[PDB]
């Protein structure tokens, strides 16, 4: 099962103290043993 | 060597043995996801105090 919790408050190291919200639940039902990320260009 | 591709005899004054009908098998399978299809069920109404 694949959980999202997203939490969006305004604001190099962060301070304070909030409580994520839960967003999307999909059972997509797969191994996942490794991940990278995405970058937008101009 | 035989041909098995036959034409339809399917016409609805013919007789018993040959007709045309509608088929449809519905495949269900139920995993360890949660089910995203459900079916309708009949409610009552809301009760307070």
């Known amino acids: ?42 | 060597c035989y041909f098995p591709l036959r034409s339809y005899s399917f016409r609805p004054t013919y007789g018993v043995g040959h007709q045309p009908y509608r088929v449809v098998v519905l495949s269900f399978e139920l995993l360890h996801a949660p089910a995203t299809v459900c079916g309708p069920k009949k409610s009552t109404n809301l009760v307070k105090n």
């Not at chain 1, 190291?13 to 409580?19: T, V």
Request: proline share 10%.
């Open chain 1, 1 to 42: 099962y694949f959980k999202i919790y997203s939490k969006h408050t305004p604001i190099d190291l962060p301070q304070g103290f909030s409580a994520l919200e839960p967003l999307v639940d999909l059972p997509i039902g797969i191994n996942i043993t490794r991940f990278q990320t995405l970058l937008a260009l101009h």
